[PDB]
Design an enzyme around this catalytic site. Structure first.
Site, PDB file in Angstrom:
ATOM      1  CG  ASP A 151      -0.214  -0.038   2.540  1.00 51.47           C
ATOM      2  OD1 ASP A 151       1.030  -0.077   2.510  1.00 51.47           O
ATOM      3  OD2 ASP A 151      -0.849  -0.127   3.600  1.00 51.47           O
ATOM      4  CB  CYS A 173       5.481  -2.492   1.652  1.00 53.67           C
ATOM      5  SG  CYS A 173       6.210  -1.662   0.237  1.00 53.67           S
ATOM      6  CG  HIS A 196       6.146  -5.382  -2.085  1.00 58.09           C
ATOM      7  ND1 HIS A 196       5.456  -4.664  -1.126  1.00 58.09           N
ATOM      8  CD2 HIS A 196       5.825  -6.679  -1.875  1.00 58.09           C
ATOM      9  CE1 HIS A 196       4.766  -5.493  -0.362  1.00 58.09           C
ATOM     10  NE2 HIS A 196       4.910  -6.717  -0.840  1.00 58.09           N
TER      11      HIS A 196
END
Ligand SMILES: [Cl-]
Ligand SMILES: [Cl-]
Ligand SMILES: [Cl-]
Ligand SMILES: [Cl-]
Ligand SMILES: [Cl-]
Lengths: 321, 325
Positions: free
Chosen positions: B96, B99, B226
């Site tokens: 989101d 992370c 990420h």
């Protein structure tokens, strides 16, 4: 906010289900197997008032079977009496084991997903002495043919029937309440599984005297639990309903002729019956009717889910203010 | 059957853990960065899946493990390449834009940063203290490959404002965070083969003397913008350690140590040895015969008590569901 009380703490849920089999005693001298202690527990649902309505609602959408609540309330079966505490229907799995899921939830706040209650029922039917259960059922059946008893037994099994388990019926509720040594009251539009199931294979002195209360509609059972801290109304469920301008007693199932002749005395031994005033159809009259006290919430620390779910709720409500 | 995500195992306990975190933060009056008093010392380990059968393992893995990042990093020889060392496993992390914080929070505490406690602490530091030395170090690093404008944008990125649900964080934010935690962070990142990822490398809490810091790192993986935690697998004889160099064909390439001043970089090995427990491990050489010693840092033993461990509650759920055959 999770869609089930259990889900606030899955670890603790498993611990709860794990206690259940060990609490079952099997006398092995003819007498029915029964719970030693756990049948005495009762869940209550927390209030959603004293919260914003937008938030009050959110909680209600996650936990409550609103479809069944509305149906039973619109038919004047559920929460018809203004003097008593509101009961709320909790969501229950519709897999054919819902009698057991609703009953397990009422006491323990978990569903019967390990099939402990379902197997206990089947066990008693396939093993223990069922002569008297059968007589009672024939007697009730004839008040309106015999491979019927055998198939009622097979229905209680965990065999796949079209839902995942066979649906259960009135005799199964009656056997269940004797396994729990605790009365079960079913609120339904036909109040024919609606009515009162007493553990009559036990002396009332050996039974818990507050009922389990379930709702039933469309082949589905749900628990109907009390909502916490909403006095000042009476903590009881009425043992009659209004019917065409009179009060009609809830049906008491599977009584013998001598029991039926003393029906009121039996209800008063197996339940805590209180005689309460309610408004008449003539606005100048009051009537006294019988009701049975409901238990206060007593699920201990270790196995109380709803206090875990309520703690999640308080956490996210602060974040949501 | 089993939950599909770790946090589902005891949501009440996750709340308890999350609620403890902001109360563990100490905010000094003398301009010293705010920092954790006690909770930065915690470390999660993942349980073994070896005792189970493939259909079951598959469900535990789909639930807990980021197998896409695990496979990307292993296929590049960046993760789990030394045979001397215990395997690390990547845990799924919410994508989101927060992370970095979710991954860091999971590594220590088994919960993600879903109350934004770490994200807010990062922003509060950048927004409400003097950040001159952070800015200086970031300048030197930027120039090694309008200052006021760009710094303000990096402060802005740290906020909880919607741009994902949040702004993605970058290297200086990791360095800030390791100083709030007083704990080094090592990032193992996707990176193009040299024959043909600057977020990868080692972030040290240089605003603290090493003796005031915890000397086991947090280990994260990074790929496609990420972050995930790379947690150690319970097992030895293999040893708990993370290599501080990567293979690069027939030689080795040190992991980057970020935001050093010039003299610090001159003594980088000395500095690494202060803030980490640096050991040497022999590996097969891809040029010369035999073998070469490379530096690695020791990783912590599991110490996250059950009382605050989702993974322990998870494993007990696995046990129950398993025995059901
Ligand atoms: Cl009324
Ligand atoms: Cl009792
Ligand atoms: Cl009426
Ligand atoms: Cl009247
Ligand atoms: Cl690197």
């Amino acid at each position: 906010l999770p869609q089930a009380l259990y889900l606030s703490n899955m670890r603790k849920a498993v611990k709860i289900r794990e206690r259940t089999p060990e609490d079952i005693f099997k006398p092995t001298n003819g007498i029915i197997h029964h719970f030693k202690t756990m049948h005495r527990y009762t869940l209550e649902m927390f209030r959603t008032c004293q919260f914003c309505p937008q938030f009050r609602e959110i909680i209600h959408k996650a936990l409550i079977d609103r479809n069944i609540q509305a149906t039973l309330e619109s038919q004047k079966k559920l929460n018809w009496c203004r003097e008593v505490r509101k009961l709320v229907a909790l969501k229950t799995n519709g897999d054919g084991n819902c009698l057991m899921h609703a009953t397990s939830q009422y006491m323990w706040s978990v569903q019967d997903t390990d099939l402990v209650l379902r197997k206990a029922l089947f066990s008693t039917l396939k093993e223990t002495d069922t002569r008297n259960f059968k007589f009672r059922w024939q007697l009730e059946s004839l008040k309106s043919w015999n491979d019927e008893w055998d198939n009622l037994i097979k229905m209680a099994s965990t065999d796949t029937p079209g839902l995942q388990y066979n649906s259960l019926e009135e005799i199964h509720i009656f056997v269940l309440c004797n396994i729990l040594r605790r009365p079960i009251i079913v609120i339904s539009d036909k109040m024919k599984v609606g009515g009162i199931y007493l553990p009559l294979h036990w002396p009332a002195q050996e039974c818990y005297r507050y009922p389990i209360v379930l709702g039933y509609d469309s082949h589905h059972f749900v628990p109907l639990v009390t909502l916490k801290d909403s006095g000042p109304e009476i903590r009881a469920v009425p043992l009659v309903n209004r019917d065409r301008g009179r009060f009609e007693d809830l049906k008491v199932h599977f009584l013998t002729d001598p029991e039926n002749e003393m029906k009121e005395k039996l209800l008063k031994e197996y339940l805590m019956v209180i005689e309460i005033p309610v408004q008449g159809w003539d606005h100048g009259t009051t009537h006294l009717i019988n009701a049975a006290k409901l238990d206060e919430a007593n699920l201990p620390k270790e196995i109380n889910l709803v206090d875990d779910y309520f703690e999640l709720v308080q956490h996210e409500y602060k974040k949501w203010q």
